[PDB]
Amino acid sequence: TCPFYKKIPGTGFTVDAFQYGVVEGCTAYFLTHFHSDHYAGLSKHFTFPVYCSEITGNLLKNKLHVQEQYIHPLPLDTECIVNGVKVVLLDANHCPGAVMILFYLPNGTVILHTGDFRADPSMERSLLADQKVHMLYLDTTYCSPEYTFPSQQEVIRFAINTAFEAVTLNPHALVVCGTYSIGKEKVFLAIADVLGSKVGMSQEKYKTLQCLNIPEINSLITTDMCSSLVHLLPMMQINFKGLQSHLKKCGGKYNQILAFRPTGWTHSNKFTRIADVIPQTKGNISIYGIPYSEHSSYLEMKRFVQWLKPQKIIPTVNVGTWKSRSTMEKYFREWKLEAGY
């Protein structure tokens, strides 16, 4: 059944709750972003109102074939009324189209649902600064102190410098980047830019990217693989067998592959820095795992919460085990005792 952490008290609203059939008492279904564990269940046969960002709306229309009459896009940073309740969509610094939602309940309670987010100090100067938030529905993906990772900027600097050096030493090397969802487009776009190439990809992935309102996108991507030396492939194909196979497909235009796997966290983060990352190599193929995260590190998450000072925190990730739930509640109490709220 729909879990309690997907329901907004005092409204008939749910958030990211499309896989339970008709939820008894739901008048509006919000969708924070276009990731499959969040949209799971949506299709052309859905006949209830969906509220979301413009970009998420483009993906629902073009990729899932949801009918236009049920898609309700809202602009960001704007007070809107939905079924008698004031709401605001805020940028979540996750993937394109991703939002946090502020609900202003008729009784005076204010609720923030973060969706999936990567907490940033810039959020401390949005509309959130303007009033008190009583309850917080929090992305707790990485809520443990072992989870450190570098800035997105640092990681893109490393990837750009690595690719540029490799291709300048060998003009017949191909760069491949893995993907299985929207998000992390900066990785392949930044590399293609330094090399003076467009990025080449399947027709399905090009269609997905043309939904995202990225400026000058027609100048940056293409379905012609031959004219491009940055290829995108399914994450599944980013291994030696898949990459050897792919190189055969290119008709001897290339003799070397340098590949990137933008992972979340991996336990080499606890020891190693970004400057010291090394690839796995077999033959003329090298594969780099780079820690490009679109979720809060532990310290980023802690700072945001200690700034916001909520009265109650509801986790939305890692909620399925008693050990995980108990651990998270310990951190929340530490944070509150240290900061004094």
Q: Which residues bind Ni ion (CB under 5 A)?
A: 35, 116
Nearer to Ni ion, 183 or 310 (CB): 183
Q: Cα separation of 208 and 34, whole Å?
A: 11
For 114, list phi and psi in degrees, rounded to 5.
-80, -10
Least distance to Ni ion from the beta carbon of 336, Å? 27
Beta carbons within 10 angstroms of residue 175's beta carbon: 26
Nearer to Ni ion, 123 or 285 (CB): 123
Tokens 């509006």 found at: 28
Give the Å distances, CA to CA, from 239 to 7, 188, 267.
41, 18, 19
Least distance to Ni ion from the beta carbon of 15, Å? 13
Least distance to Ni ion from the beta carbon of 182, Å? 9
Q: Would you state the structure tokens that stand for residue 60, as one six-digit string? A: 């629902």
Least distance to Ni ion from the beta carbon of 281, Å? 31
Least distance to Ni ion from the beta carbon of 34, Å? 9
Nearer to Ni ion, 41 or 283 (CB): 41
DSSP state of 300: H
Nearer to Ni ion, 35 or 205 (CB): 35
Q: Cα separation of 145 and 298, whole Å?
A: 6
Nearer to Ni ion, 35 or 184 (CB): 35
Q: Would you state the structure tokens that stand for residue 271, as one six-digit string? A: 């020891």
Least distance to Ni ion from the beta carbon of 121, Å? 21
Q: Would you state the structure tokens that stand for residue 301, as one six-digit string? A: 């998450």
Least distance to Ni ion from the beta carbon of 96, Å? 11
- Coil, strand or helix: which one is 155? helix
Least distance to Ni ion from the beta carbon of 116, Å? 4
Nearer to Ni ion, 261 or 295 (CB): 295
Q: How many residues does the chain have?
A: 341
Judge whether 235 and 179 are in contact, CB under 8 Å.
yes
Q: Cα separation of 140 and 158, whole Å?
A: 27
Closest CA to 283 of 253, 247, 249, 250: 247
Nearer to Ni ion, 35 or 118 (CB): 35
Report the amino acid identity of residue 236. M
Q: Is 212 exposed, middle or buried (0-12, 13-18, 19+ CB in 10 A)?
A: middle
Tokens 């996108």 found at: 217
Least distance to Ni ion from the beta carbon of 71, Å? 20
DSSP state of 4: G
Q: Cα separation of 152 and 136, whole Å?
A: 25
Judge whether 59 and 208 are in contact, CB under 8 Å.
yes
Nearer to Ni ion, 94 or 198 (CB): 94
Nearer to Ni ion, 116 or 300 (CB): 116
